[PDB]
């Protein structure tokens, strides 16, 4: 597989590259994810327990907060970083099943993007 | 007693501000 | 100016008083309508004037629910003569203060301030309660702020317990709630409140106590505005009967809390009401209470524990009252307890405000303020017989049981019962 | 609360509108000066219409009198040297500033959702822009202004059937004249007011969800009042601008520019050199790059197409381009390729020049092309790159 | 023919109203003839004359001072020290606290049960209380047992045990307290306050201190405290009410006798770690709670400061309001007007603290979130309003407010005997009532915008909030509030 | 364990630290630069 | 005062002609003092009874009805009227006074105007 | 909050914890204190432990034995067999029960 970063090693230097961006700032991958972009990353968000949520929103103050000074994580901190620990993804692929199946059967959606 | 003040303080920015903006120095 | 640690210079200082003055005299006026006016002079430079009426919960049955602590609420409100703003703003001009109170068998109307404003405080006083405006806006105003001050009845488990009690305790008069139900709120109004006191606040059943004051110029300022009131044949306070109760809210969750009462008699009795003062000392959450009427009382113990702890609370405090009644109490347990009582009372009678409230409290019942020093030889006479047989008797007669909380662990009302 | 009393002037209705959309609106605290441009633009277009009601006082939209009123706007109005200059050179500066505020939207990916209004009501901004400064070029009435007109009024032929009836239509006759140069000095009065509109309309659709910031995640967590924190961060934007566009008035005035439009037109010999301005020699490129009339046109128009078709493309969840390197990269050759497009519309149509245009042609388009691909093989980033 | 007025429900209610309200057009003249809502200056120096405060100095600079009414019945006596939290180190901070707790745990002579079965006796009351620069222990007693809680109070200042295992036992009771700050959030927001306002200064440490210093407490830490502090020069013995001046004095001068005799003084301690007020904020956001409390202050005036007088007036001009308050719309101060009228806060209250050498002035609220904007700007207001506008009937009645509070929160032995001893150890003397009310009356409009012009206008705040306190203005909303741009 | 959040309430410093990458402070007490 | 209907007699024909007009709406005088108009008629309104009040809207409800239908009350229905029986007169004058006497002590007004 | 509505349902859930006592006394309308703390790992604990093969009647009207047992068994016969377990005893003592 080309993306697997086990058998590519481009794809382990895309891996690396990502990865030391998201851990200057103390993110996660799944921080970027916005709830306004996907109204399935609303509906995923919502299902998850709150201290998952809580946890999410103090890494993008204190990320947002990094970025307003132009600073970085201390090296410290960036030792114990954990960029790729996933919490949205396997609850974003139930909802979008959920709603595949909503389509298959000719269900209404239970949520709608307003038109802007 | 410090309305008057006041109004006494803005009328002379008032008037140094129109001496500035236009400056009649060749008509007084 | 100068820095506060240097004197000041060109200040008049008026002559120190001598360290010993002589206590006052308590000098009681009736008026031919049934009002009596009382005062003492005091050394302090502070005045408190009050007007104290024996009405409350238990004249509002059956059709006035909730009437005497709207009244409370409604004190020092817009009158006939001027309106609330006029009325707060002469309080402040003369840097005053307002107090109410309302009680089961009394309500309080109280000013304080100094004593060159005696005038301004007996014109005031005396307006707010003999003429009332009752106005519909200022009225629902303090009904709104009513429902705020019994929604949180649930945060104070002590007085929420302690009129659950006096509702389950007591069968007529006494057992009508002093915190109405949001139901007997709504059909309280300017008319209901207008008819309640002019029923009930009459001149043969108010009290002018001014402490701090001279009996002659409190004299020239409310006479005046007093002596109009007709006179109303004194009438006879409604009786209330004790029964047993069993008060159970079970909310749930956590941190349960309990009260078991009995009766103890009231204000009259003057011998067995200092007996019950006493054993409340001596049994000293965990504490004990007393709310004594004019011929009944309540002695209780309270109590929290856990809400799985609650059956072994009931016991343990149950074996108290045992305990005491049997005459397992030393005299040096006594003697703690005796003094706890003298000393107590002395200084509860520091503050003017207390004092004052003595005074209107026990003229509206006794018609004659009683010296302490009866009431101490009372307490340095109780033996270990008397506060044993008292509490033998205590415990034999019906008992009244509240809990809230988590009752489900609470043992049943039968089961207390027995204990005793 | 219970609004008994007026408090601060501010919420009053008089001016509650005014507060919540502009002292008080939540902005993220990480934003850089990157996202001044948008007040730069805005200031721009004020100065467009000052400036220019002004020399509309002194400008006359004919023919015969058209390029003398104008050197009599140089010569003889007091200031009117300053007025010309600073409307001249204020079209260029309002194109460079319009220009970083696009590309700050292509790094940060602002256009994605949910703000696809918001670009898509850009994209008919710069459009407006586009014919606003061009029809305004032609007033003048010099040999660049006329060789201007004559061809972009007869794009319109590239059309099979009815081309050649609205070139004619456009050009009010058979060529252009007088009839041109009329109606095109009342659409450059006209055009601006409109212009208004959609950037107030364009603001208002940002402000439904707010303005992105350059770490492109969730910012509610971080926002405070525009007033006075990113006031005074666009009043030092607005000062450097000020200072750059002092520059160009009282330094270079015709640096960014041509002497051809300072002979008057003559219709009967063209100049060896016919260029635009240069904010639209990038698309001038992509026109001289096809070997057609009709697919020179058609091109144009996949242009501002591509434009409007990517906010809704399927794309990744990652919007900023400090977290996505192939990205982030792909961005940088894509300004490089705009700069080499606007170089290449300067020159001549010749060797190596043709090869040249056409492959920067390529290369603008597959910028739009392979972006949509980015997403669709982005999108399964978080499941193989497991920690 | 149409119908009477009284038909109709809706005519009939009308009737009602309109005669209630002619009734209320008639005023009657008997009660309207003494009370006025005009507030007037008024001098009355001969009610406030009172028993005399005898102040004698022993020879060891120890202070005894007394208030003699031999009418009443009890007594209160007790020890004023200068001493608190101010005063210890970073290392020994929280030692002042952990006196407090093992004062009352047994002496030579006295063990715990001895010491506890003693007082309850004779009824009587122990209290132990310490703040920054203040520590005090006194006895509420009958007046035959003035002598015996005399020989109390000097055995536990003097021979005091200190066990190790009852240390031990009161190391766990403070550190249990200090995981437990909570359910007191008033005591919370102006501990956060002091320690933002008084940053790197002795007056910003809290009383209860660090966790690692009560861990590492032991006997010598707390006989080293009471030697360094616990002084003659440094005390104070006040007593109020059914005691004479010669006998405390004769019982002070047997039992006080192997005090500690430092040569440490309170004014060289002051001078050489000064307080000082750095404009800053702390923000506790949680929006858990269900409401928001916080205070804004301004550096204030030290007890010797005439200004502080001033700022006495300038807080009843303020002043305090909570919900259960009837009358909150009508009160002289505009502050409270805004808050009651507009329903803005759960409650409101101005605060004016001193200290030897610095002080606080501001304004502490209860409020729901959503009504921190409007709250915030009201508070502001106001408070920079006293630089600009200050009407003679406001001044006049915050100072007839002022003079009557005084006077009648002193009432009862305890309360005097505080008032003793605090005076004796800020001014060095009690103020007498004439005194202090003709400062009072010196502070008239004019004075109040002066000072209110020194400490209140374009000066830098310090800010602690707690709750939900998002939509809290920030610093900056804060500090331009502190002055008009309109003059 | 206990929270940052929650030992940072229960514990008010006298000595904080500030953040110092962009500003350094004046020396505490020190008079304000108004 | 020549305003006097008994008095002056152009006054009788002022009061006659505006009794008449509002007998055709079925409303009384004090109906057309609008709460909008000024905060003192709110107050007022707001301290009158709901039995007042909703007899008040009711009217007002007809009149727009009869307005709208370019019709008249029927001269049965218009016998009935009472076009001058006030029920809005003494409170708010009660209103104006209350609001003068703390106009007069100096405290701030219980209710202002939006700056519209 | 919609069942003092109902004077019926109310005073009969009422008096079974006012005169039981025990398991009988535990409401079947929880209330606005054990909701909090209910949540969907303590709905699978009490189902695991309650929901024993041997507790379980299936019952159909209106079907025959064979088809139901072809369809019933292979859902049904991987149940452990767990033994019963004795039924909470509860006693009767008579109470009270008063609200205003
Ligand atoms: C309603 C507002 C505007 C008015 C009344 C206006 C009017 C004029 C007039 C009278 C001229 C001819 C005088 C001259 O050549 O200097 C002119 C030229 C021009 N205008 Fe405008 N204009 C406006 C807004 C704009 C805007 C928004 C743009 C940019 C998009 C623009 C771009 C130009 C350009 C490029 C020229 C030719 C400059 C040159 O002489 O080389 N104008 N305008
Ligand atoms: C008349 C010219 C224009 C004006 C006055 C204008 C004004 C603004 C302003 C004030 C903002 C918000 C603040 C900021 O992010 O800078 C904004 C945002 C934005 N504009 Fe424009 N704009 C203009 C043209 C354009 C064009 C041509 C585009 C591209 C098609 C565009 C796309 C955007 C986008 C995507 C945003 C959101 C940026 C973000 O929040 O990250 N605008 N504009
Ligand atoms: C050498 O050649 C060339 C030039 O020359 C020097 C140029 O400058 C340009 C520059 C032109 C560009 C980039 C495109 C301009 C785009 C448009 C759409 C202009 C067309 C608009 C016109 C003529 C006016 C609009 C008319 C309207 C709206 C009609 C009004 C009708 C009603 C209101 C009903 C190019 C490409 C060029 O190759
Ligand atoms: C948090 O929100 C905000 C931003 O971030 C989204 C901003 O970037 C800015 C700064 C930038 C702005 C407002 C750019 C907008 C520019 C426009 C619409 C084009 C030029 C504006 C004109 C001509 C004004 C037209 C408006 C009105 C009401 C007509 C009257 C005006 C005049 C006569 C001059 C502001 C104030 C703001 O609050
Ligand atoms: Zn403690």
Redesign the interface.
Known sequence: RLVDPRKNFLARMHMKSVSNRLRRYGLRYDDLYDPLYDLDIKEALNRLPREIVDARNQRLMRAMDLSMKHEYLPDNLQAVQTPFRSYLQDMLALVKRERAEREALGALPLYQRTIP | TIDIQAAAGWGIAAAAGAIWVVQPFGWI | ?????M??QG?????????????SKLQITTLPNGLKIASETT????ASIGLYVDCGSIYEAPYFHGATHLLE?M???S????????????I??????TSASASREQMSYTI?????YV??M???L??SV??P?F???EVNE?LR?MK??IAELAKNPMGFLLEAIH??GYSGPLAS?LYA?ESALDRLNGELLEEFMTENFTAARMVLAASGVEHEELLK?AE??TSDLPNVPPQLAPKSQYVGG???Q????EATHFAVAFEVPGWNNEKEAVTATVLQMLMGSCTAFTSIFNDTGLFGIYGCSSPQFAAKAIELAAKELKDVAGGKVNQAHL??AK??????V??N?????IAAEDIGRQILTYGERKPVDQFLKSVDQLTLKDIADFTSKVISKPLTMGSFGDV?AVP???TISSKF | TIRNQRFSLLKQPISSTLNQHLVDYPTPSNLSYWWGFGSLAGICLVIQIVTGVFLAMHYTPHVDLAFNSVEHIMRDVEGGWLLRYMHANGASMFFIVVYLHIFRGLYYASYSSPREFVWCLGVVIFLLMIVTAFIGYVLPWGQMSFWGATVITSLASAIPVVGDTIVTWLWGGFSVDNATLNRFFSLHYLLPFILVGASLLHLAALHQYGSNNPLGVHSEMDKIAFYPYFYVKDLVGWVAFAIFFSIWIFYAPNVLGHPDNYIPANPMSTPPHIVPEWYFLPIYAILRSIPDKAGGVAAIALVFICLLALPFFKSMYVRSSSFRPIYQGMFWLLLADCLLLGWIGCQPVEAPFVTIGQISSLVFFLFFAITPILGRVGRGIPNSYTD | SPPPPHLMPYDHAAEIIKNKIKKLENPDKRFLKYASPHPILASHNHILSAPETRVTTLPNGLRVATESNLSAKTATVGVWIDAGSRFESDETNGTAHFLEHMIFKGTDRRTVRALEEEIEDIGGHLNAYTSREQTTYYAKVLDSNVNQALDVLADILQNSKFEEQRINRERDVILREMQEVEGQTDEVVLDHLHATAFQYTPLGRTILGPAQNVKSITREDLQNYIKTHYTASRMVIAAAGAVKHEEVVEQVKKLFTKLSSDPTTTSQLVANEPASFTGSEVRMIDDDLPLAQFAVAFEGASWTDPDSVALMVMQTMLGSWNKNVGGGKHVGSDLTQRVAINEIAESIMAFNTNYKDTGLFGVYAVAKADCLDDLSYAIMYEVTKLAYRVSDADVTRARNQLKSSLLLHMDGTSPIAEDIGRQLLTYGRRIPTAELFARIDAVDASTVKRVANKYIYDKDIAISAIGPIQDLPDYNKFRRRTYWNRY | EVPATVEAVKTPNSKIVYDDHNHERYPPGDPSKR
Chains 1, 7 share one sequence.
């Open positions: 100016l100068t820095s506060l640690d004197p000041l200040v008049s200082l008026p002559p120190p008083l001598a360290d010993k003055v002589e206590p050394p302090n430079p502070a609420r004190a020092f409100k009158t006939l003569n001027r309106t609330h703003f006029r009325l707060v703003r002469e402040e001009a003369i840097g005053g203060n304080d301030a100094l004593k060159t005038p301004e007996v014109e005031v005396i307006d003999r003429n405006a106005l519909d806006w303090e702020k705020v001050e509702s389950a709630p139900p300022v005046p505005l069993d008060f159970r079970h909310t749930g969750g003697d703690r003094a706890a009582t003298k000393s107590a002395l200084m009678l520091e503050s003017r405000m489900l049943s009302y039968d």
